[PDB]
Amino acid sequence: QVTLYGTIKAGVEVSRVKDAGTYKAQGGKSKTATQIADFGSKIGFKGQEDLGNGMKAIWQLEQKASIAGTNSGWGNRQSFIGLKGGFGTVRAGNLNTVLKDSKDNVNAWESGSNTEDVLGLGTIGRVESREISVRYDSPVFAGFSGSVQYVPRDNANDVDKYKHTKSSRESYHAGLKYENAGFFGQYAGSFAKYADLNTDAERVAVNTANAHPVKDYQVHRVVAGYDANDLYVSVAGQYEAAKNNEVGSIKGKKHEQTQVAATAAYRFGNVTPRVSYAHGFKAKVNGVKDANYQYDQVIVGADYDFSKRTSALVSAGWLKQGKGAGKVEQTASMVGLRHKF
Amino acid sequence: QVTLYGTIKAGVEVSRVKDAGTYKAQGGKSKTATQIADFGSKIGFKGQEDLGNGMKAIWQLEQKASIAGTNSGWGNRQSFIGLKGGFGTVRAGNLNTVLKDSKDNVNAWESGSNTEDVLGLGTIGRVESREISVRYDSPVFAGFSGSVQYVPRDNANDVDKYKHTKSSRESYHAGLKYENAGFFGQYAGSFAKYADLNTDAERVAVNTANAHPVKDYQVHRVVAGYDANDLYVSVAGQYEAAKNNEVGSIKGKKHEQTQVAATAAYRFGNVTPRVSYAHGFKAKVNGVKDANYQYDQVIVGADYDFSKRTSALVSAGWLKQGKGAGKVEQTASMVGLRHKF
Amino acid sequence: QVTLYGTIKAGVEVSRVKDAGTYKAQGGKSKTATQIADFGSKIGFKGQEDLGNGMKAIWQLEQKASIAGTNSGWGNRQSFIGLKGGFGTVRAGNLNTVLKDSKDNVNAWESGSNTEDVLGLGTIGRVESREISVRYDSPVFAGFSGSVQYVPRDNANDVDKYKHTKSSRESYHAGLKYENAGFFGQYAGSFAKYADLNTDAERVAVNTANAHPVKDYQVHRVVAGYDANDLYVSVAGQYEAAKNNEVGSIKGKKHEQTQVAATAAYRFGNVTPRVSYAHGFKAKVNGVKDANYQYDQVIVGADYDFSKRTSALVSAGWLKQGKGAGKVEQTASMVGLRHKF
């Protein structure tokens, strides 16, 4: 039969930006923003049937479901149909990319969408997405699991099914994980010979306004540390690079940026203090060191677990972006509540 | 664990408007409108977990779900997360305003959206809404319960989190209820030092087209009668007032209107005849008696209860709005069916 | 109490169009389109309560729920409230038209929306729809069942409830079915004295851009064969006609087209090979034989049933539309998977 599940999560977030360019007030100070915000409440349906020969059918329909009433849609979170057996798992649908699944071991902070960059490691998680795709996941081979994912060209670009006037945006995603004696280490990455980027280095759909076409787009993520014995610690290294593919005098010219992230948390019975640091390095844009993309952020917080499904959350965030006169410093704090059903 | 619930309700409504200004036909008569209409079918999910120390976690996700297929969205009806214990209730989310909860004791008629003004006391219920908010509800103190609700400034106006260029639309909502020997009496009200209104005296979001900015916006509702022993009777008094806050020669100038409503119903086993009268008084707009907002409406109807969850509904509505040559008279009737699950 | 149900279905579809007018490449050949596509996954809620006197209350809320995340809305598939007893069934809501219910015995192919015309008998199913309506279904009288359905004028045209400036789009739908010794034969049809059509002969809402107003719009469907003993066979005949109702020199001038469809399938235990042919005849448009609407399509495929709720699907489609130089040939194939819960 079928299972219903979800997570409800919300809280109040206080936030303050200090931007020289956009803010009248002396110092460049914006005012306090005091807001009730949903942290991405979701609700889902999933089922499975045994087909007899050690093989199951699997499906999921998960949805964003903010308790502030700002969401609509079915299947807009990870949703699929698939088969599972001795050979492993195959799914097709609106699937978490391999790099998005690796978020658990990198970014565990709960946040409003307005504070996902300051109160969470949102910047390093700008390469996570959901894509319509087929995906394979291997069984666990003595602590080793792996996965491979592919986005078809015509799933990447519907307009051009029958007229390949635009280059293919087909993308490959792939991952290898190792867990043993609690210890964890994994590689996550993606490649697209052709892709498109926004100014925030997030990938955007082909034909989005102000999108910059790129070639040989590739992301590399590596995480390790581990998760057991009343303690968590992880570190992650992320590398991303592409080449300019906008005709003009910059075409073929090389983009890249390197990010690192560090998180540690220790559990005192029902209280789990946590700390996270992240660094966005110097960015090379069009083969030119560009300091606008460099950043330093630190998050501190803790979770009180009333039960194994209900937590209280608190956290504070410091974020500095760029260098020089065009600097943006974000500070925010939160108190919140979460329920998993 | 988790509960699923809802209400399905629909029927056919006949309606006829008699407006001098908008209608060609002699008398000013519009034609019969004969329509199948949803009366606001809804579907919801709610759960709760005991946290041990006489304290529960609570959540809800409720949605409009018209069986005519005109709704989309999650959490667009009362949805929240909260905590309940000996101290009472605290919720945060898309919450019924305190004045919206008081609708049960004032307006109990089921209706299409097109007939909510004639086949229900819709006019007096123009001050009911749902707002993103924190809300406290007191335990029942020997028949006395109370509640307090607040909308943050930055929840009232997202655009201006960091630039308080516009005045705060933060609002307070508050209520006191007393139930005893069946007898009921309650006060419901709200205050916003700054708010915005449409031409129909409904509150609208900041920056809505043709919205009139107001100051010291305050609503006052009072209801009493009671509900037991095969009989219901209630009466309600509503007062609303603000000051013009549109720069120009009218600013600071005073708005107000007073409404009264009366309902009685007696139950003959499985049939519950009901009657309702409402009066919208002379309106003072910009300190000037304005008769356009005055109205008189009467509703008569009954409910046959096939079961405690399935009812048949019938009702007829007479509505007269304004005075003079610019008069609008609405007549409508309905037959319907409702199922609570 | 209440039931949850649905169907999850998706697969990969390959498709190729060969159009002289729209395609550069020599032959007129478009390129392969290789796509992951949802075949119309849906999810629904339904319940019923006994009212005692051999009579039940019934409701449904069904929704499109593509696992590619492209759907939003509640009640956008067949949703209703109703009563059922010895006398039969009455429903009111977003109801399947009588002709849409007859699709099971005519078109059983699962498909993406982009391939519903080639990998399914989509063309003959251009007269199926869901309309806000009241509907009666008769009990089975010795193999005979019948149904009647009506769309109110003001449900057909909301804008004009009170100003009948536009002619009524009220429509009647009606059907008679006979099942016995497995044998099945049924009549399905609809009539609207006034209606509107798109260029693809699909009915569109009043005031849709490029809609052609028609009068005496009527559809006639007839199906027979039968469904038992390890074998299925059906044949269907469809007739549709109207008169031009666009003022201009063509008004009153007569439209019509005749379609026929043929399907046979035999079950080899868990494998059900199937074949379907369909023919769209010469069309008379404005009383003028027009060959653009003529077509010939054939589908071959089979279903492997892992269980009684999980199937694997395969099919291939050939479609030729029109005659002459303005000819469109579509070829497509699919492999897919379906789960009914």
Author numbering:
A (entry chain X), B (entry chain X), C (entry chain X): 1 to 341
Question: What's in the article?
Answer:
PorB is a trimeric anion-selective porin and the second most abundant protein in the outer membrane of N. meningitidis, possessing a binding site for antibiotics in its pore. It plays an important role in the human immune response to neisserial infections and has also been linked to inducing apoptosis upon infection of host cells. Isolates of Neisseriae with intermediate resistance to antibiotics have been reported to exhibit single-point mutations in PorB. These mutations are located in the eyelet of the pore, the narrowest region within the channels, which contains a large number of charged amino acids acting as an electrostatic filter. In this work, we show that a single point mutation in the porin PorB from Neisseria meningitidis, the causative agent of bacterial meningitis, can strongly affect the binding and permeation of beta-lactam antibiotics.
Crystals of G103K PorB from N. meningitidis W135 were grown under Jeffamine M-600 based conditions as previously reported. As a result of manual model building and interactive refinement, G103K PorB has a final Rwork/Rfree value of 21.3%/26.0% for data refined to 2.76 Å. The G103K single point mutation, located at the periplasmic side of loop L3, causes no significant changes in the secondary structure. The high degree of similarity between the G103K and wt PorB structures is reflected in a Cα root-mean-square deviation (RMSD) value of 0.278 Å (for 340 residues) (shown in Fig. 1B/C). Looking more closely at the mutation site, the loop L3 folds back from the extracellular side into the pore, forming an α-helix that constricts the pore to its narrowest point. The electron density around K103 was solved clearly from the α- to the δ‑carbon atom, whereas the density of its positively charged ε-amino group could not be determined due to the potentially high mobility of the side chain. The bulkier side chain protrudes into the pore and decreases the open cross-section of the pore constriction, approximately by 3–5 Å as compared to wt, altering the PorB filter geometry. In accordance with previous computational studies, wt PorB shows two distinct pathways for the transfer of anions and cations. In the G103K variant, the bulkier and positively charged lysine sidechain extends into the pore, thereby occupying the pathway for cations and leading to its disruption. Our experimental and computational electrophysiological data demonstrate that the conductance of G103K PorB is lower than that of the wt protein. Ampicillin transport is substantially reduced for the mutant compared to wt PorB in these experiments, demonstrating the effect of the single mutation on overall antibiotic uptake.
